[PDB]
Structures are given as structure tokens and as C-alpha cells.
Design a protein around this ligand. Structure first.
Ligand code: 2BB
Ligand code: NI
Length: 164
């Protein structure tokens, strides 16, 4: 259940995810496929948008052993504070890294894999991860934070690679 991960310039990466209607068996099977897809490569997070599923679903696992499954369905940002920035790589942006500004601390409301509501306060990489994947669900990639010139450099470099 390693799903095809979309790579730029793909237009489908800029689509906005719908709210999940009900967390039923079908949603959980998407969730479970997202984990396996995420686990097949380096990475700590994945938004449904990235596998062409346009529903507000995010999976995260930051553990070394890949045994700490976090599920965010219909996430809502409640609060944020501070600023930070790391060189983010994105599965959907082949072989590019770039620093992007983020809140340092976030608080979010979401539904878990059972459809049960919860709240989560995050900082460090987890805060960054969460915002990065929530960006994906509104068709926003980390490159959008960069200058038009740098954005065009990334786009040139990929038209070179996807060609070969
Ligand atoms: C930037 C990360 C919060 C999310 C991405 C991610 O894990 N990349 C790594 C990363 O840059 N660090 C800082 C861990 C990676 C490039 C090292 C795999 C993820 O692969 C994605 O694109 N999810 O939509
Ligand atoms: Ni990404």
C-alpha cells in the first residue's frame, strides 16, 4: 500500500483537501496506506494531498523505529507562537532543501484514526512537521515561501530531472 507520491510540477499538488465527512473503514485504509507510503522512504510526515487523496488527512511518525503513529484528520490550528526555520526537504519536491519560516509552537484540534477528537500542543520538529503537512492540505508547498527567482530555479532543476 505504497501509494504513488506526487512530484512537482504536478497540478494536483495545488488542490485543496475537503473535510473528512466521517472516519469510517475506508478513511482508515487511506490512513494505513499513508503510513506505509511514508515508511517506504525517508520522511516523518505525509498529507493526503501528496498521494492524490484530497481529504484533510495527515499521518506523522517521527520515531526512529517507525512505531509511533500519529494521525491528524480535519486538523484545526488553535494557537501558535514564536518563529523558527529549518532546511526542509519535501517528498513532493525532488532533491531541494530550503529554510522556510514557521511558528515554533502550535496547538491543534483533530480527529484520530478512530474518529475521536483530541488536542495536541507541539514544538520543535513536530510543530514544523504539522504546519508543513497542513500547508499541503491547502495546496501549499514550502517553495511558496521563497522568492520568485528561487522558485523558478527549483522549477528549472526539476524539468531537467523529470525529463531524464
Ligand atoms: C520537512 C518535514 C517536516 C516533512 C518532510 C520530511 O520529513 N523531510 C525530511 C526533513 O526535511 N527533515 C527536517 C526531517 C527529510 C528530507 C530529511 C526526509 C516530509 O518528507 C514531507 O514532505 N511531508 O509532506
Ligand atoms: Ni512535504
Amino acid at each position: 500500500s505504497v501509494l504513488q507520491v506526487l512530484h512537482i510540477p504536478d497540478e494536483r499538488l495545488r488542490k485543496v483537501a475537503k473535510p473528512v465527512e466521517e472516519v469510517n473503514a475506508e478513511i482508515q485504509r487511506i490512513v494505513d496506506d499513508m503510513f506505509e507510503t511514508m515508511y517506504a522512504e525517508e520522511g516523518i510526515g505525509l498529507a493526503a494531498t501528496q498521494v492524490d487523496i484530497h481529504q484533510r488527512i495527515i499521518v506523522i511518525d517521527v520515531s526512529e523505529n517507525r512505531d509511533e503513529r500519529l494521525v491528524l484528520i480535519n486538523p484545526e490550528l488553535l494557537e501558535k507562537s514564536g518563529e523558527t526555520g529549518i532546511e526542509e526537504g519535501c517528498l513532493s519536491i525532488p532533491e531541494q532543501r530550503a529554510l522556510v519560516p514557521r511558528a515554533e509552537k502550535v496547538k491543534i484540534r483533530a480527529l484520530d484514526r478512530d474518529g475521536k477528537p483530541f488536542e495536541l500542543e507541539a514544538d520543535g520538529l513536530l510543530a514544523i512537521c504539522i504546519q508543513h503537512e497542513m500547508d499541503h492540505l491547502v495546496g501549499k508547498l514550502f517553495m511558496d515561501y521563497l522568492s520568485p527567482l528561487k522558485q523558478q530555479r527549483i522549477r528549472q532543476k526539476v524539468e531537467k530531472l523529470d525529463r531524464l
